[PDB]
Design a protein around this ligand. Structure first.
Ligand SMILES: [Zn+2]
Lengths: 179, 60, 109, 102, 356
RNA sequence: CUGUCCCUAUCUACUAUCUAGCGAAACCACAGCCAAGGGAACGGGCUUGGCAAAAUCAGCGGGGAAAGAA
RNA sequence: CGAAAGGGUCCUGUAAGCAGUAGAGUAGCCUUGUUGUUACGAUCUGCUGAGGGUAAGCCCUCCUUCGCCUAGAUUUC
């Protein structure tokens, strides 16, 4: 038993999961599902389809050079069974797995570094050319404030206070027609 | 109220189709009380019977 | 608790119209909205706004939107010896996206 | 955990492991993993603008209808004082200006 | 079709009855015969076969197994039977203290509006020193009865279904004298029995259930076509069936936290698939994983009983060496055993970055 | 390649459970469970046996249809 | 118990919009351009395994929110 990798997409092709195809040239095509099988039969290119590990590694969406990635390899010269070797191999598997995950987090963040700059620049443009759609007050409110600010002796702060309160706190369609 | 008569007379006096005549929903009582081509002209002047514009037929 | 109360809901017309015949999706959507309001407010007298009807019929008879955000208001029906004392009026509310909104009670003040 | 012991088994693996943790310690020492109001409010303002754009688009598509229906002109239809006053004071208009009118 | 299963009437009762318990001889030790459970679904296994004479010997073979969730089963009663020229007759029954709300729900039909007044006078018949009466019933069972059964009900409260009504059945006691088995049942009152105490691993057993209903079905699917022996149209499905010879491969303890783990894949995972059993949910209790298919729909009540006869095949003596248990999502063409595996495979996502 | 067959595609035509309301006709001695016997290749009532439990719904592939004889 | 919501899982395949002289091409300014400028612009890349759908016969819920509840009608030794 071995966790095979799908030829077309690269997800783990577990046993009893999928179909394999034997070309006359003599080497076998293992697909993990019917999606991959039908795509290859229609002769689409995995290197081009954007939901495949081939596309991810060709467009540079996943890391391809890391000592964590050269620990993994198919082994062609078998070794003798050795209990401590196998147990230490298990522990190494755990360590390499967590290191890979954490380096993958760093790779993703280093790729998606610049997001705030672009988003904030878009926000500046949106505000600059949509000045008029910003949260306004309300006539009765402004008026009311003036009387209560007169009572409390303050108008400006009372405004930008309720401007916040109302911003911290939808419209329907139509209404009842009286019968 | 039945306003087939008012619909027909309004179309005839406005020179348009029955699909182009519009009766005010809020004034169905007055439109029903109107039963002559002089009363319907009075309503047309008053704004309760309205001829709709032709459908858009943009050519560009 | 109060007899008169308005509350805002979201209806999964996708779930209530899965499989229905194409030339009936819209009328069945109206019927399911009526039943939803009846179950939510306990009123057999439910009236839907004509603009809610146009909202449902926006994309033709077979193009009913997946989820609709509505406001259901139960009020008194006075009339004169009406069969039911309370009635529910259902309106459509203008929302950016009919997802992510919980059920909320709207205040008349 | 979805990994092959057979693929990861390697004689003389302690050297490779020790090299790996030594490299990690180098990386945290270097800073490979060192994680580093006006912007928040301008983003909030932009989001409010986008919400208003969506609302106005919704109103427009609500009034639009599908296929070329003849509509009643605005100069023919009449509109209530309540609606006018509401819309005006939403835009921020002092309301003692109106009131006699019609 | 078949002239044996010909009254193609629907099963009169949704649970299904054993209809035959294994022949009793006192030489064997005292034990219970059957048990219940609820079908969850099926998963895929690979087994290192050890079957001399088959080309699959000393190899890995992919095999289909079914999951039956079996929470502990509460014993609440003891029924004593006499043997008469007209057959077996229920001489008398003895219940226990504090029957649960689920068995009382089984007794009632409209449980919500009812005054829940079942076995109140029986609880008084215990608590008010009529233990003399209860003991005289027990001695009547000891002195006059030849077949003794145990009333047992499951725990829908633990089983993840919308239902709340339990399932009673009579499970025959075998292997001993009538006095010994009556003492066993009386000592077993008000204690749950575990499926690993009823059966164990690698025991070929029998499953009784009600096979799925299809309603009014034409002859093409009812009889497989191109007097009472002629193919007719009518009810196909919802049929009481007793399927024999199904090897129980694993009893999972539920609380082990590594129920799906074998000695070859050191993966700490449970039997529940990634995303849960489709239309059933999660198996959080003791579970029986059995070779092959089993009559019945998911979440349907099951009856698991021992074989009526001693086995005649090497298939029953065989030991089972599991290698891995399928845990991938049954909701589609899944490929990940665990959420950790999926995250490690796919890396971090936009939602992960925005949340963190 | 065919004066051959089958399947897929299109068109044409006939194809349809329950509720509200409306609402026929064909046909009709009386009936209708079986097996043996009832000389007249005749049984539906008779003999003697099998049996045999109210009231209904659906499906239907069986019976209630046939000669006249050189 | 019901409706939403969140998370999980599965299906599709990378949303709208913006930007980079990357971009084949289309034209004006002034005079020669050895590196001239100014505008439009298919197409590409990034934002983006994103966006969309997800039980209608999928799964889970710690106060995730809101609502409901001890009914009303008949019959029985
Ligand atoms: Zn694949």
């Amino acid at each position: 038993m071995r966790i095979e990798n799908c030829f077309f997409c690269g997800r783990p092709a577990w046993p009893s999961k999928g179909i394999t195809f034997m070309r006359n040239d003599g080497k076998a095509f293992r697909f993990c599902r019917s999606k991959c099988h039908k795509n290859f039969k229609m002769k689409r290119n995995p290197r081009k389809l954007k939901w495949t590990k081939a596309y991810r590694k060709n467009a540079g969406k996943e890391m391809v050079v890391d000592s964590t990635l050269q620990f993994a390899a198919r082994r062609n010269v078998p070794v003798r069974y050795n209990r401590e070797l196998w147990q230490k191999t298990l522990k190494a598997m755990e360590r390499i797995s967590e290191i890979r995950a954490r380096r993958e987090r760093v790779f993703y963040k280093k790729r998606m570094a610049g997001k705030r700059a672009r988003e904030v620049a878009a926000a500046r443009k949106l505000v600059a050319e949509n000045e008029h759609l910003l949260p306004r007050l309300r006539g009765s409110e402004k008026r009311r404030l003036a009387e209560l600010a007169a009572e409390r002796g303050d108008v400006e702060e009372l405004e930008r206070e309720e401007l916040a309160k109302l911003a911290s706190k939808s419209k329907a369609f139509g209404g009842e027609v009286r019968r | 109220v039945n306003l087939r008569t008012q619909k027909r007379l309004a179309a005839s006096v406005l020179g348009c189709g029955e699909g182009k005549v519009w009766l005010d929903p809020n004034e169905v009582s007055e439109i029903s009380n109107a039963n002559s081509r002089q009363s319907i002209r009075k309503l047309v002047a008053d704004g309760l019977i309205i001829k709709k514009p032709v459908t858009m037929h943009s050519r560009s | 608790i109060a007899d008169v109360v308005a509350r805002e809901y979201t209806i999964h017309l996708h779930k209530r119209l899965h499989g229905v015949t194409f030339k009936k999706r819209a009328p069945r959507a109206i019927k399911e909205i009526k039943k939803f309001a009846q179950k939510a407010m306990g009123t057999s007298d439910v009236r839907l706004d004509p603009q809610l009807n146009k909202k449902v019929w926006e994309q033709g008879i077979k193009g009913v939107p997946f989820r609709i955000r509505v406001r259901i208001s139960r009020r008194r029906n006075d009339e004169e010896g009406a069969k039911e004392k309370l009635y529910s009026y259902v309106q459509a509310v203008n929302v950016k996206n009919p997802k992510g909104l919980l059920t909320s009670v709207v205040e008349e003040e | 955990d979805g990994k092959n012991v057979y693929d990861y088994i390697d004689p003389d693996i302690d050297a490779k492991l020790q090299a790996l943790e030594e490299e990690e310690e180098r990386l945290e020492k270097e800073g490979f993993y060192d994680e580093d109001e006006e912007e928040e409010e301008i983003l909030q303002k932009a989001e409010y603008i986008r919400e208003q754009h969506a609302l106005i688009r919704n109103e427009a598509k609500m009034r639009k209808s599908l296929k070329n229906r003849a509509i009643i002109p605005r100069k023919a239809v009449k509109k209530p004082l309540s609606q006018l006053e509401d819309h005006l004071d939403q835009l921020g208009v002092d309301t003692e200006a109106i009131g006699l009118r019609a | 079709g078949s002239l044996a299963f010909l009254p193609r009437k629907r099963a009169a009762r949704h649970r299904g009855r054993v209809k035959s318990f294994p022949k009793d001889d006192p030489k064997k030790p005292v034990h219970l015969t059957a048990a219940m459970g609820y079908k969850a679904g099926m998963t895929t296994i690979v087994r290192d076969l050890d079957r001399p004479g088959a080309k699959a010997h000393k190899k890995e073979v992919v095999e289909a197994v079914t999951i039956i969730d079996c929470p502990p089963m509460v014993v609440v009663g003891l029924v004593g039977y006499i043997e008469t020229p007209r057959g077996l007759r229920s001489l008398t029954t003895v219940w226990a203290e504090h029957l649960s709300d689920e068995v009382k729900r089984r007794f009632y039909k409209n449980w919500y509006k009812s005054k829940k007044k079942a076995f109140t006078k029986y609880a008084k018949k215990y608590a008010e020193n009529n233990g003399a009466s209860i003991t005289r019933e027990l001695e009547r069972i000891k002195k006059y009865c030849t077949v003794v059964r145990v009333l047992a009900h499951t725990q829908i409260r633990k089983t993840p279904l919308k239902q709340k009504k339990a399932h009673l059945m009579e499970i025959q006691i075998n292997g001993g004298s009538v006095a010994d088995k009556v003492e066993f049942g009386r000592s077993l009152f008000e204690k749950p029995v575990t499926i690993d105490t009823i059966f164990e691993k690698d025991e070929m057993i029998d499953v009784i259930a009600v096979t799925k209903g299809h309603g009014f079905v034409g002859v093409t699917a009812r009889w497989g076509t191109k007097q009472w022996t002629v193919a007719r149209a009518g009810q196909m499905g919802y049929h009481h069936r007793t399927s024999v010879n199904h090897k129980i491969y694993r009893i999972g303890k539920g609380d082990d936290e590594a129920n799906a783990s074998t000695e070859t894949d050191l993966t700490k995972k449970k039997i529940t698939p990634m995303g849960g059993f489709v239309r059933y949910g999660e198996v959080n209790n003791d579970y029986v994983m059995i070779k092959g298919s089993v009559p019945g729909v998911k979440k349907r009540i099951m009856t698991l009983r021992k074989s009526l006869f001693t086995h005649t095949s090497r298939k029953a003596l065989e030991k089972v060496e599991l290698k891995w248990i399928d845990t991938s999502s049954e909701f589609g063409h899944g490929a990940f055993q665990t959420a950790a595996e999926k995250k490690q495979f796919m890396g971090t996502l936009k939602k992960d970055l925005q949340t963190s």
